[PDB]
Design a protein around this nucleic acid. Structure first.
Ligand SMILES: [Mg+2]
Ligand SMILES: [Mg+2]
Ligand SMILES: [Mg+2]
Ligand SMILES: [Mg+2]
Ligand SMILES: [Mg+2]
Ligand SMILES: [Mg+2]
Ligand SMILES: [Mg+2]
Ligand SMILES: [Mg+2]
Ligand SMILES: [Mg+2]
Ligand SMILES: [Mg+2]
Ligand SMILES: [Mg+2]
Ligand SMILES: [Mg+2]
Ligand SMILES: [Mg+2]
Ligand SMILES: [Mg+2]
Ligand SMILES: [Mg+2]
Ligand SMILES: [Mg+2]
Ligand SMILES: [Mg+2]
Ligand SMILES: [Mg+2]
Ligand SMILES: [Mg+2]
Ligand SMILES: [Mg+2]
Ligand SMILES: [Mg+2]
Ligand SMILES: [Mg+2]
Ligand SMILES: [Mg+2]
Ligand SMILES: [Mg+2]
Ligand SMILES: [Mg+2]
Ligand SMILES: [Mg+2]
Ligand SMILES: [Mg+2]
Ligand SMILES: [Mg+2]
Ligand SMILES: [Mg+2]
Ligand SMILES: [Mg+2]
Ligand SMILES: [Mg+2]
Ligand SMILES: [Mg+2]
Ligand SMILES: [Mg+2]
Ligand SMILES: [Mg+2]
Ligand SMILES: [Zn+2]
Lengths: 95, 64, 31, 87, 272, 117
RNA sequence: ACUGCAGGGGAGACUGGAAUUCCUGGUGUAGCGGUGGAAUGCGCAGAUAUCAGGAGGAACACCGGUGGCGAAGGCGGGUCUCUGGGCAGUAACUGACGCUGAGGAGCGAAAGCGUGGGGAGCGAACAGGAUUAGAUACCCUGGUAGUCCACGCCGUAAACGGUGGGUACUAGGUGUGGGUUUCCUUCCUUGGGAUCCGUGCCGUAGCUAACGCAUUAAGUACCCCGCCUGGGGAGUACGGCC
């Protein structure tokens, strides 16, 4: 039960409407074990500063969970192993 | 004279790439304390922010 | 000239190690 | 490690009177708790030498404290030894 | 994981053995066992075609599922981890939730009681069998088939693994534990993970009799043969063989792969 | 028969040599006349004179294939770093954009032992 | 104990980019490389160069410092997980429980050793080239161990501040790092002062053979330990332990 800020860089090939349920199907496993989500903000398409995974564009997502370390590690696992993500960056907002 | 020492509750996060635009040279080099006028802890914070921005591609690793 | 004091020790140690390497076998391992 | 609400639950059980936190017994109790958790930390991470040295520092501290209590009064020594675990 | 006997006897001086710490249920599953008899290296003609075989402990064959084709979507539980005399890897008894009993090669990190998925939607965990299409590039895999539906044939001995190198159009490029880079069809399926028991290569068999137990029969050097028996034979004292080293059949050492074999198109870079 | 009006001059000025290559913007070399190509050998290929003949030769050979307009990517800690680009200027190319592309290792490969000369 | 605080302190997992090397292809031709000057060497079978992709290993530019942390050895790409110490403040608690420490135990750069991996670059040995009277070298071309990883072993370094630990006191001046606290307090200045803990420089008394040390002492004292008794022989022999 600790704060976590997660930025995820998704492929620009998928659309702006199907991004939210595609992330709900990941965050529900975070929800099943007591962890909750505060803000699932989506910055959308954005040009990224150096070529990443054969894409020069990327969808920015900020996840902002409050969850156990095991659950956040599992979430990072799952969304890093999916084919719809180019980057993941997990941090803690708390001290 | 350090900007963040003067101005409070401005947490340094790699998300604020707009603020991180400065403290970075046009080449992409992290500026030194003698050129940013800022303290050791805030220079640590901005350096960490710049590096995480680089690894999330919010800031260039190499640029001209 | 304090390095001279180191050079004498160096030469003595070097010759001793050279002797041991001349005899790391039944030349000395038996004894 | 050993947050406030985690140390209180053995401060009541090992310290003397509702506010005792520096007595021999209290110090043995939370040093023992620290050594237990850090020995778990060292059963994982076999080669964290800088933390294992901290463990030996705590062990030495607790040894001085147990000899202190055994000299000052021996019945309390017996009770604390039975209710923590020695040898 | 390797336990060394003490030098209580000259046959056990440097010998070692697996501690068998991963094994549960030292007996095999009865319905899944079929008979097996030694051959002594003899083919259908009754003649020795592989030298140095014979004797050795009696063995029973357990059926390993190198297919894993027919239970996509139905989950399995690793019921047991068990000895198998027939391979250097350990085997995992899986209970499928539909009630089917199965043996698979035991990967690293499939302790008894955890869940194995199969098919395109399986999670990328050790033991899950997926098509190379659904397996991402860079991960360590094993028991990978050469042809779609032909069964696992690649990296299935203890400690072996392919890493998936890439998938460009319809072929997965992958590094074979010989170090060889090969392309196979992306619909060839593999199970994620290294093969377990990776430390059995460190076993020092202490004595001749132990290899005799494992079925290897003494090998005689060609240079102590007579010329009638071996090209290296002959000579008054001991020689080096009076010629460049050749097999007992006079074949010089050198590449023996068919230079015009049909699989050269898929072989990208031969081993180093 | 390959005709392209715009190009890039990659210049590599190492302590021993200078190599001038003329490529298309896509990065396909057409002309490459270097300091050994212009008659030189040994330590004389390090000199700015060799630099400003190699660049001239590359420039003329690239004009033979039809480049008016070049942009320069210079690299290397050599003395033929300016003589070369003025040679391309005065051999008929227009200098366009000038950059610096000397590789800067982020403390990667361990360098060779320092010369005890 | 509580509240705060700074930090490359440590361990594990995952992960990022530059650069070097190699491979595949595109272009393209006769050089490249290297030196004080060359040659060995690489290339003409397509090298060097240049573009794209890919493999892999190692180290983590700018931040970066004179700085920080660690008992010392040492420690920095990033993230997460676990974890040690330190500093300040309150005075809540114990009430001398302290200091040192023969032996002993642990930690202990690099090299080295064992087993198993890995191996880009570098590079003992080695080989060739060069230089030279010779050149078992310095320089060049290659290049094995090793350097890296896991786990053990080794237990040594100019392991140095060539300065054992603890404590008290004895002008200051000036930086820098981490806290706390009072005055123009909203004149913001994030100035001035006090105090605690570092860390540097300069300097008084004092000390010193002199060099210099000098509140971080090599000063003034006390406690405990280690060590020396001319240079070699020799940190060697013998014995013993590892
Ligand atoms: Mg901070
Ligand atoms: Mg003198
Ligand atoms: Mg017959
Ligand atoms: Mg045989
Ligand atoms: Mg005979
Ligand atoms: Mg016969
Ligand atoms: Mg014959
Ligand atoms: Mg014979
Ligand atoms: Mg003979
Ligand atoms: Mg740390
Ligand atoms: Mg690259
Ligand atoms: Mg290679
Ligand atoms: Mg080529
Ligand atoms: Mg090339
Ligand atoms: Mg009292
Ligand atoms: Mg001692
Ligand atoms: Mg040790
Ligand atoms: Mg080493
Ligand atoms: Mg080794
Ligand atoms: Mg050796
Ligand atoms: Mg090895
Ligand atoms: Mg050399
Ligand atoms: Mg030589
Ligand atoms: Mg490790
Ligand atoms: Mg010593
Ligand atoms: Mg040192
Ligand atoms: Mg000494
Ligand atoms: Mg003292
Ligand atoms: Mg001070
Ligand atoms: Mg002074
Ligand atoms: Mg003195
Ligand atoms: Mg004497
Ligand atoms: Mg001795
Ligand atoms: Mg002896
Ligand atoms: Zn500041």
């Amino acid at each position: 039960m600790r704060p976590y800020e997660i930025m995820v860089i998704l492929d620009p090939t998928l659309d702006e409407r199907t991004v939210a349920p595609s992330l709900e199907t990941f965050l529900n496993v975070v929800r099943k074990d007591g962890g909750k989500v505060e803000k699932v903000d989506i910055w959308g398409k954005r040009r990224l500063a150096y070529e990443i995974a054969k894409h020069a564009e990327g969808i920015y997502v900020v996840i902002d969970v409050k969850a156990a370390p095991a659950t956040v590690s599992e979430l990072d696992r799952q969304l890093s192993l999916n084919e719809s993500v180019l980057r993941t960056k997990v941090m803690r907002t708390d001290k | 004279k350090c900007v963040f020492c003067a101005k409070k509750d401005q947490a340094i996060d790699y998300k604020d790439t707009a603020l991180l635009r400065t403290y970075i040279s046009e080449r992409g080099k992290i500026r030194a304390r003698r050129v940013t006028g800022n303290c050791v802890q805030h220079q640590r914070d901005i350096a960490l922010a710049v590096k995480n921005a680089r690894e999330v591609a919010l800031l260039p690793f190499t640029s001209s | 000239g304090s390095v001279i004091k180191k050079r004498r020790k160096r030469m003595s140690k070097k010759k001793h190690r050279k002797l041991l390497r001349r005899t790391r076998v039944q030349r000395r391992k038996l004894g | 490690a050993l947050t406030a609400e985690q140390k209180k639950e053995i401060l009541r059980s090992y310290g003397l009177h509702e506010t005792d936190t520096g007595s021999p017994e209290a110090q043995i109790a939370l040093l023992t708790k620290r050594i237990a958790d850090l020995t778990e930390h060292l059963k994982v991470h076999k080669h964290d030498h800088h933390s294992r040295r901290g463990l030996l520092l705590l062990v030495g501290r607790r040894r001085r404290l147990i000899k202190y209590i055994s000299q000052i009064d021996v019945e309390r020594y017996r009770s604390l030894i039975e209710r923590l675990g020695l040898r | 994981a390797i336990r060394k006997y003490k030098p209580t006897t000259p046959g056990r001086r440097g010998a070692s053995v697996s501690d068998f710490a991963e094994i549960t249920r030292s007996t095999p599953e009865k319905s899944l066992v079929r008979p097996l008899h030694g051959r002594g290296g003899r083919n259908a003609h009754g003649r020795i075609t592989t030298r140095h075989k014979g004797g050795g402990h009696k063995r029973a064959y357990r059926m390993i599922d190198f297919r894993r084709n027919d239970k996509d979507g139905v989950n399995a539980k690793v019921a047991h981890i068990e000895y198998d005399p027939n391979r250097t890897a350990r085997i995992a008894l899986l209970h499928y939730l539909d009630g089917e009993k199965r043996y698979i090669i035991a990967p690293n990190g499939l302790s008894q009681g955890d869940v194995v998925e199969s098919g395109a939607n399986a999670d990328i965990k050790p033991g899950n069998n997926l098509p190379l299409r659904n397996i991402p590039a860079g991960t360590l895999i094993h028991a990978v088939e050469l042809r779609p539906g032909g069964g696992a044939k690649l990296a299935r001995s203890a400690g072996s693994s392919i890493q998936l190198l890439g998938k460009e159009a319809s072929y997965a490029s992958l590094r074979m534990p010989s170090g060889e880079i090969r392309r196979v069809d992306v619909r060839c399926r593999a199970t994620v993970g290294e093969v377990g028991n990776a430390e059995q290569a460190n076993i020092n068999w202490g004595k001749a009799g132990r290899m005799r137990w494992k079925g290897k029969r003494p090998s005689v050097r060609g240079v102590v043969m007579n010329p009638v028996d071996h090209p290296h034979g002959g000579g008054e004292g001991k020689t080096s063989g009076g010629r460049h080293p050749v097999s007992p059949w006079g074949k010089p050492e050198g590449r023996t792969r068919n230079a015009n074999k049909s699989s050269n198109k898929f072989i990208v870079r031969r081993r180093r | 028969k390959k005709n392209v009006p715009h190009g890039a001059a990659h210049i590599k000025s190492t302590f021993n040599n200078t190599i001038v290559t003329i490529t298309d913007p896509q990065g396909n070399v057409i002309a490459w006349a270097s300091s050994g190509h212009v008659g030189f050998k040994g330590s004389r290929k390090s000199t700015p004179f060799a630099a400003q003949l190699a660049a001239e030769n590359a420039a003329r050979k690239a004009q033979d294939h039809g480049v008016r307009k070049v942009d320069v990517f210079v690299k290397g800690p050599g003395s033929g770093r300016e003589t070369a680009i003025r040679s391309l200027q005065a051999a008929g190319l227009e200098v366009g954009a000038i950059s610096d592309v000397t590789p800067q290792p982020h403390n990667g490969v361990r360098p060779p032992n320092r010369r005890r000369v």
